[PDB]
Symmetry: C2
Subunit: 99 residues, 2 copies
């Protein structure tokens, strides 16, 4: 599709047979999801934004379907009002910004 | 231009005939630029992200230039560690996320 920015670019994604809402974020290096149970062993990771830095948990090779588009990679889990899809996944589904 | 997300979508902007560098962020509602001095009255605002909330100075009917195109909008000035172009101006230069 072509997502415009009059409103937040929210999309439905699927993870573990679950449909959830996510935000397509060109300003995020990594994908950050809300608190949830993912398969496996995590390592610790630090990420920074406005407020500063926080330590999140990280899982590898996680499958997420974005608008019927399969992507597989690193997902971070930490506190957020929304799941965030960063360029690590947006590249995969093939998203670009046009103007 | 059509931008890829292999790398951060950083662009050059021209603000107060001073030409900074900023990242096209669709995760951002508003535009927030590190500290500087612009004309007009500013009103305090408080914006939140990873790591929390910072207090910024809000200015309106501020003119910016993103890759040629002229946009008008509110712009928040403050303690960001990277200049961010948000939805508020991205729409003005008619940017879309495509996949």
């Amino acid at each position: 599709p072509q997502i415009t920015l009059w409103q937040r670019p929210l999309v439905t994604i699927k993870i573990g047979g679950q449909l959830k809402e996510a935000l397509l974020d060109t300003g995020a290096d990594d994908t950050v999801l809300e608190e949830m149970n993912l398969p496996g062993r995590w390592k610790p990771k630090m990420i920074g934004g406005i407020g500063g830095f926080i330590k999140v948990r990280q899982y590898d090779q996680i499958l997420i379907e974005i608008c019927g588009h399969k992507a597989i990679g690193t997902v971070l889990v930490g506190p957020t009002p929304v799941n965030i899809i960063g360029r690590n996944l947006l590249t995969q589904i093939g998203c670009t910004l046009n103007f």
